[PDB]
Design a protein around this ligand. Structure first.
Ligand code: GTP
Ligand code: GDP
Ligand code: GDP
Ligand code: MG
Lengths: 269, 442, 430, 150, 49, 430
């Protein structure tokens, strides 16, 4: 509008039009609120693009080099990453990760499995015809799809100490994504669901739908997802950490509750 | 950071209900102690800490004690809607009242209950890390408010020492009256309050009735209306500790700016945008208009006229959309006025505070919604008129020992009346001497 | 030649945030702290205000002190806040309460040792140390008391360096605090003994600059702090860029101070003009000089027309001819000869620097030593004597522990400073 | 003193806090075009003494006093930009051209299988917008390789 | 340490939110004004015809 | 050159578990025992702490001893417990009862033979044996009594090797045990004759390190055991990696123990800094040396400023110049000359190692032989004399079998060592 022209209307009209021209034309980096809100919207739109997941194999086993999802037994959410919650650390770049519900496969929750070259010095090697099948006790890597970004990322963890803690609760180990890979801190080993038959099923092929526990090979601490909730650009998401969850704190070594169990999700037939 | 509120007797508990209703609604704590999560902002805020502490489960509980000798009003709080908000130990109640006798509260009955109150206050002060004062609400017209309030302020003053104590006190109105023995209790209360209080805020119910009839359009007001206005005033004064602003004001700043000599600590209070919803949308409410409003005697919450005295200090709190340049222009225009006068030894008479949070609107309230407000507390020699009229009424009854046998039976020496009357006479002469100007040479 | 900055109190931390934004912008430092400039001229003197941390980054050599962390949480939350070193924020647990005695004697001695430890680590880290620079208000509580305490300690530990202060002083028209005369009197008493050069700014003068020159309808403290950050970053410009006639804080001091007590100066910055008018007038040395001497553009309430100039200094930034600068300073001295003290043959020093502030073709900052500054101190002394005769509010100061003799000493020292200015104003050759 | 019932009423009880927007510094000081200020980073000595025989141009006095541009020497800025490109803040992305002898970051099986099956059309479709994904270098492997040397 | 970081993060998010809401409010006011003008011009033309 | 480790008692087993985690991490050994490293420099000295078992595996050269299996069952059940050789876990069936005499005379002789059999098998298995390393607390019961018993047997059987101990000593502010003075006095009496070098750590000093330097809000024993594991693995780093100036445990002992009875040392580690601040300051030799001599970073309650250094040692890790190390040690000795013993012309030995701890550009570990350790022993002797004069708990010890003459001998022997420090502290060149 124009209003009545009493007082300082001329200079303020000029000031307002110059401010409008500055805001519309200049970029100003992160200072501008509208531009950063728009870029966060574009961020969310990009991260949730659909992905053509692979169908289950005929033999019914777990295979390498195939897109997959990770779902937790307690939260019933899928593992996801946020590329922009990143801070530089003395050991490298750390990218935060969480677990969230989703409507299907996406660029933020589809992973592949890549085997590691060294076993635990008492391994019985698999036959040449089972090279692509994943066996219990065999280390492997978890990696992001090549379409997400230029440099592939990997799931890593670090030992707990004064300078290392979990994201929310701060009482367990930290799990994060990093361009670091092919290192001793990126190896994971799966085990059997039933505790008494755990060492009878060692070095055997894994069925496509088995419930299983993932352990950090270099620290021997299982992967888990608690019920702690934090907010980000996508909404409310849960926490991901390495630790053993038990019913009685007085006996830390014992039965493990449902939030140490995971599963692999394929595409519907 | 933190402050503890002490509510004594009937008026103090009923004003406490309105205050905690307001503090809950402004911070957002539900009546059962919970606080809904926000999805637009990622994390919550510490602002409740001044008035609330959270349990490990996230329930909120308030930093207050309610003290009374009769159970009925506290039992009404215990059975009402906010039952789950308060901790049951905080609501302390005796069996029987002080029956409008200051002597019964101070000597006979309050001596048994006072140690439980001190144990609760100690347990609160242990759960703090930056306590910065006590706020006290009581009426000096009744027996337990005067007697137990004085005894408890004496004990707090010995145990905690330098910590500040700011009082909101309901004094006997100048012509509306409720009980015959009000002058004796008010004089004996004021004697103890002189030594053991840092700032005393004065209220009169007749002024708040005048304010609710003239500005709002209410023909038949009741105590809930007055208590909602008092709650708004206390929220305005304590907002400077709890929300972001351009010029913050800590509770110690009040004592530094308003009290020139240790006995001259009684202050007048006023509030500007008392307006109804229907009137509010026909008029602008600029900074200069509300600044002009706070100095008219129709805006005051105590029945005294400041044109018969001199100002010594003023503290102005602005909350809402205000810009410092407008505050400076308004204060310079006020300073130009000839009907506003300051003692010649106080040239820099003003302290300013500016906070961004506008005043909150309460669902059943009668005030309109407004973008800005200003509240003033000021020290002026005009307050001497209130004591002189209470002292004259005391002299009229005491000349014939009208009711003294009750006080002597409940444990008091007759000498205590004469001592208190001489102390109030000295306070009157202090206000006479401090207000004398030596501006004329020779 | 390295400067160490000290930021004290709410006003000091707020002005400092904008100053460090302006300095980081001029040297092309990203708000993440990474150097992203595009010419070696920006990098070659970055050491003057920044220390170098590993992998490109720079951190600013400043100490932030305050008694309540609210302001520091606001600056850490600001857009450039991340650049500041976390260990450089020092805070207590209770406010100054607007009382000089608390800030100097009771809560001061507990933190002062930790502040001196940080200041000593920063001074001893430099390969060659230049003077300290301090910004604070004299009307506040922690600014006056703790600032003057730290100034006294640094003057004991480094007596051969320079001590420079920028200070905010109460306006003549409206007070923000009732007890301003005590804090101002004791702070001026401490500064006149300890300081080497002190600059004074009135908030009322910045409001008059905004309303009259820039015609802003609703100015805010962000604008006042940008004007202050602009002039403060301008006085030091010749230390950190090349130029045809270099200058240094000691060279300004040697040309500006005739006698050691006469170290109080007026400030001005020339290129100010509203956005509607700016398209109608180009920058030139006559225009800058004309605005430079207009009392409308001076940042203190006293006006030069009631006094005389003992000395003045002008620092020009930009590529310009020396003839126009020299002839303008000669023309102003010759045409207004009655306003310059006659027993000094030339009162103006000039300096020229090649690199102007971003977005301006040329700029000048003006520093003036004028006897009209005596009028503000006289006003403060009158209000102090009115308050002191009745010992107003004195129990706060005496309860903290101060002897009444400090008040009489501070009053006597300010009265002698006013007398000394008045006698040199009316001096003659005879 | 009947209490509140729904969360919406409790939310609308509070009015939102007022917000004062500080004036931008460009609105107070800038004199040229507000959307495109000229860059002045030239000294008189650099712009006066040139190597005329070598080939670089000479400048008149009016040209010296009224020229816009940036000084030619930018060696240290180039070195800093390269270092931050290796670290990860560099826009030109000087790194990622080659890898060190013993600082591998991806297993070779990922490159041979499940690394050569990228869909360029799908990637171009998902990159289309005002947001582009960052490129994060493998600084950890590099500094690990530097650490284990004598 | 966690409390201070939480405070700082809340302040930055709330400040961004306030800025965006102010800008959207101004834009909506301008749009409503323009729409009113257009509909009134159309009404005048229709009545004349 | 291989070391044999012994872990005794709850404190010893807990510190040992974290130590073996840190060592397995530094050499890239999986908790299954598989080598997963990425440079031959990691593998080439693995023999120093590990023996090689068949088909690739490595086993850690450690003996675990305790009197009640609760802690041992927890560590064997722990995540790295499998790496330990099963035959190396030795435990009894009844506790030490927190009593030194019970731990030394009654339940000790039953297990000591099985412990000596395991220790002799490990020592005689080495191709060349370096010193033994013992971890225990002095305030406990089985740690002090059975640890000193085993030390006495190893000193009789292997008198030519080195005996090194890391020991926990009672805090000056809060006791964890009522009978601490007896156990401490008898243990120090045994070590004064038997030990070659003993390092002492106070838990209160680790709490002050965590709260003041690292600013942890809620520290736990995992943090304290990480600080201890870091320093213990740092002192031996030059034994197992290349460097410009090699060093060894025997060379450290010869350069730090002037006279024979003086063999108690304080320890410190320098690059401690909080996770938020570490991005803001790069490592350099002046910064490490200045923090390294700051008493804020020292792990004992006694402060060097009340005593004088008789000798010292600094072990540096990283690629760095020898000139900066030498000139820093000279500059610190010259500027603080009053705190260094005059008869020795140079009190500090330096050593340089090429390989730093992961994630740090540079690090130093500091060992110091200072006379202020005498203040701790005097305080322990005062508390002992207070308890002994009243026979406060003596019937337990006499019922175990001790003659009262042992308590007077132990008191006399300790009183002598404190006097020896007093005489060497106040000795003169003459
Ligand atoms: N403004 C206001 N005044 C009140 C309120 N309740 C009581 N009063 C006034 O305070 C005085 C009565 O004091 P009370 O609080 O009833 O006295 P008490 O503390 O109960 O003392 P006892 O009667 O001995 O129990 C009268 O002047 C009342 O008008 C209230 O809720 N608001
Ligand atoms: N120019 C300017 N003045 C300020 C600023 N902040 C506060 N002031 C003034 O400084 C005085 C208040 O002092 P303050 O800094 O609060 O004192 P402190 O409490 O000791 O830190 C008043 O006169 C304010 O007007 C600011 O950002 N700029
Ligand atoms: N730093 C540290 N001290 C410990 C630890 N465990 C116990 N202590 C301390 O050692 C002392 C107890 O000795 P203890 O090991 O129980 O003796 P024991 O019963 O003979 O094994 C107390 O001072 C404890 O605080 C630990 O893991 N770390
Ligand atoms: Mg009652």
């Amino acid at each position: 509008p124009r209003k009545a022209l009493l007082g300082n209307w001329f200079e303020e009209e000029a000031y307002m039009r110059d401010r409008k021209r500055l805001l519309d034309s200049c970029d100003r980096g992160v200072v501008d609120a509208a531009r950063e809100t728009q870029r966060i919207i574009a961020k969310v739109k990009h991260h949730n693009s659909a992905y053509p997941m692979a169908e289950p194999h005929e033999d019914g086993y777990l295979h390498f080099y195939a897109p997959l999802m990770l779902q937790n037994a307690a939260t019933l959410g899928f593992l996801s990453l946020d590329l922009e919650d990143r801070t530089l650390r003395p050991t490298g770049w750390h990218v935060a990760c969480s677990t969230a519900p989703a409507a299907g496969p996406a660029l933020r929750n589809c992973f592949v499995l890549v085997p590691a070259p060294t076993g635990p010095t008492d391994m019985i090697p698999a036959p040449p015809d089972e090279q692509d099948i994943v066996h219990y006790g065999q280390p492997f890597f978890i990696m992001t799809v090549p379409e997400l970004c230029d440099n592939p990322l990997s799931l890593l963890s670090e030992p707990k100490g004064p300078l290392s803690a979990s994201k929310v609760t701060g009482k367990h180990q930290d799990v994060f994504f990093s361009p670091d890979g092919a290192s001793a801190e990126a190896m994971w080993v799966a085990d059997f669901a039933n505790p008494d038959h755990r060492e009878d099923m060692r070095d055997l092929p894994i069925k496509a739908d088995a419930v299983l526990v993932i352990r950090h090979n270099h620290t021997n601490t299982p992967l888990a997802s608690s019920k702690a909730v934090f907010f980000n650009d996508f909404g409310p998401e849960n926490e991901v950490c390495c630790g053993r969850f038990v019913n009685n704190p007085g006996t830390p070594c014992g039965p493990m509750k449902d939030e140490n169990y995971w599963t692999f999700v394929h595409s519907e037939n | 950071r933190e402050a503890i509120c002490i509510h004594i007797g009937q008026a103090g508990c009923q004003v406490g209900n309105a205050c905690w209703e307001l503090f809950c609604l402004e911070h957002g704590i539900q009546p059962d102690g919970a606080m809904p999560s926000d999805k637009t902002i990622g994390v919550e805020d510490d602002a409740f800490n001044t008035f609330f502490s959270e349990t490990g489960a996230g329930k909120h509980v308030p930093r207050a004690v309610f003290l009374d000798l009769e159970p009925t009003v506290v039992d009404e709080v215990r059975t009402g809607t906010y039952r789950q908000l308060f901790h049951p130990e905080q609501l302390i109640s005796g069996k029987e009242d002080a029956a409008n006798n200051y002597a019964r509260g101070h000597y006979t009955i309050g001596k048994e209950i006072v140690d439980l109150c001190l144990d609760r206050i100690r347990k609160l002060a242990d759960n703090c890390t930056g306590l910065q004062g006590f706020l006290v609400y009581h009426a000096v017209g009744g027996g337990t408010g005067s007697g137990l309030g004085a005894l408890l302020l004496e004990r707090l003053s010995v145990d905690y020492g330098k910590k500040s104590k700011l009082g909101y006190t309901v004094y006997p109105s100048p012509q509306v009256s409720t009980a015959v023995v009000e002058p004796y209790n008010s004089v004996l209360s004021t004697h103890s309050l002189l030594e053991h209080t840092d700032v005393a805020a004065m209220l009169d119910n007749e002024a708040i009735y005048d304010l609710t009839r003239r500005n709002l359009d209410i023909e038949r007001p009741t105590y809930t209306n007055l208590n909602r206005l008092i709650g708004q005033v206390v929220s305005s004064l304590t907002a400077s500790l709890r929300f972001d602003g351009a010029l913050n004001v800590d509770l110690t700043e009040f004592q530094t700016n308003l009290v020139p000599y240790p006995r001259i600590h009684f202050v007048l209070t006023s509030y500007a945008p008392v307006i109804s919803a229907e009137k509010a949308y026909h008029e602008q409410l600029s900074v200069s208009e509300i600044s002009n409003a706070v100095f008219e005697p129709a805006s005051m919450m105590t029945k005294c006229d400041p044109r018969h005295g001199k100002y010594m200090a003023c503290c102005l709190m602005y909350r809402g959309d205000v810009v410092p340049k407008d505050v400076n222009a308004a204060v310079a225009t006020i300073k130009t006025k000839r009907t506003i006068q300051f003692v010649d030894w106080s040239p820099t008479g003003f302290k300013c505070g500016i906070n961004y949070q506008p005043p909150t609107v309460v669902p059943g309230g009668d005030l309109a919604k407004v973008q800005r407000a200003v509240c003033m507390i000021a020290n002026s020699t005009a307050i001497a008129e209130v004591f002189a009229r209470i002292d004259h009424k005391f002299d009229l009854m005491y000349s014939k020992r009208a009711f003294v046998h009750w006080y002597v039976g409940e444990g008091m020496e007759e000498g205590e009346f004469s001592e208190a009357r001489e102390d109030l006479a000295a306070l009157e002469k202090d206000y006479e001497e401090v207000g004398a100007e030596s501006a004329d040479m020779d | 030649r390295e400067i160490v900055c000290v930021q004290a109190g709410q006003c000091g931390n707020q002005i400092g945030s904008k100053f460090w934004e302006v300095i980081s912008d001029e040297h092309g430092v990203d708000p993440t702290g990474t150097y992203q400039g595009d010419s070696d001229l920006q990098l070659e003197r970055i050491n003057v205000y920044f220390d170098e941390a590993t992998g490109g980054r720079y951190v600013p050599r400043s100490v932030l002190i305050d008694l309540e962390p609210g302001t520091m949480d606001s600056v850490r939350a600001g857009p450039y806040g991340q650049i500041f070193r976390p260990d450089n924020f020092i805070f207590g647990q209770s406010g100054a309460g607007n009382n000089w005695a608390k800030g100097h004697y009771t809560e001061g001695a507990e933190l002062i040792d930790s502040v001196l430890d940080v200041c000593c680590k920063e001074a001893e880290s430099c390969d060659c140390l230049q003077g300290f620079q301090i910004c604070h208000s004299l009307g506040g509580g922690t600014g006056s008391g703790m600032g003057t305490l730290l100034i006294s300690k640094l003057r004991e530990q480094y007596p051969d360096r320079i001590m420079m202060t920028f200070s905010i002083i109460p306006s003549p028209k409206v007070s923000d605090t009732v007890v301003e005369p005590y804090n101002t009197t004791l702070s001026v008493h401490q500064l006149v003994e300890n300081s080497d050069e002190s600059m004074c700014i009135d908030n009322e003068a910045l409001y008059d600059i905004c309303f009259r020159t820039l015609k802003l309808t609703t100015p805010t403290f962000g604008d006042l702090n940008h004007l202050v950050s602009a002039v403060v970053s301008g006085v030091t410009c010749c230390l950190r860029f090349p130029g045809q006639l270099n200058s240094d804080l000691r060279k300004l001091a040697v040309n500006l101070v005739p006698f050691p007590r006469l170290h109080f100066f007026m400030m001005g910055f020339a290129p100010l003009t509203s956005r509607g008018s700016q398209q109608y007038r180009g920058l030139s040395v006559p225009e800058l000089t004309q605005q430079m001497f207009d009392a409308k553009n001076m940042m203190q309430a006293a006006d030069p027309r009631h006094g005389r100039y003992l000395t003045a200094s002008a620092l020009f930034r930009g590529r310009m001819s020396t003839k126009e600068v020299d002839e303008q300073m000669l023309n102003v001295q010759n045409k207004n000869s009655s306003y310059f003290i006659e027993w000094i043959p030339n009162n103006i020093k000039s300096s020229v620097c090649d690199i102007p502030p971003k977005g301006l073709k040329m700029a000048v900052t003006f520093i003036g030593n004028n006897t009209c500054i005596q009028e503000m101190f006289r006003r403060v002394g009158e209000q102090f004597t009115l308050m002191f005769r009745r010992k107003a509010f004195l129990h706060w100061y005496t309860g903290e522990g101060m002897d009444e003799m400090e008040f009489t000493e501070a009053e006597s020292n300010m009265n002698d400073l006013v007398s000394e200015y008045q006698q040199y104003q009316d001096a003659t050759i005879e | 003193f009947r209490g509140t019932k729904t969360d919406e009423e409790l939310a609308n009880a509070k009015p939102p806090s007022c917000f004062h927007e500080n004036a931008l510094p460009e609105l107070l000081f800038y004199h040229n075009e507000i959307t495109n200020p000229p860059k002045n980073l030239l000294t008189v000595n650099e712009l006066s003494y040139t190597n005329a025989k070598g080939g670089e141009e000479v400048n008149t006095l009016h040209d010296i006093l009224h020229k816009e541009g940036v000084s030619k020497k930018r060696d240290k800025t180039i070195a800093i930009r390269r270092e931050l490109g290796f670290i990860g803040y560099g826009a030109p992305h000087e790194g990622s051209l080659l890898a060190s002898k013993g600082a591998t970051a991806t297993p070779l099986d990922y490159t041979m299988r499940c690394g050569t099956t990228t869909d360029q059309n799908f990637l171009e479709s998902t990159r289309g917008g005002c947001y582009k994904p960052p490129v994060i270098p493998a600084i950890g492997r590099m500094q690990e390789k530097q650490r284990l040397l004598t | 340490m966690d409390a201070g970081d939480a405070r700082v993060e809340r302040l930055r998010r709330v400040n961004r939110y306030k800025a965006v809401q102010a800008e959207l409010a101004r834009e909506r006011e301008e749009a409503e004004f323009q729409a009113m003008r257009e509909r009134k011009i159309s009404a005048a033309a229709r009545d004349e015809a």
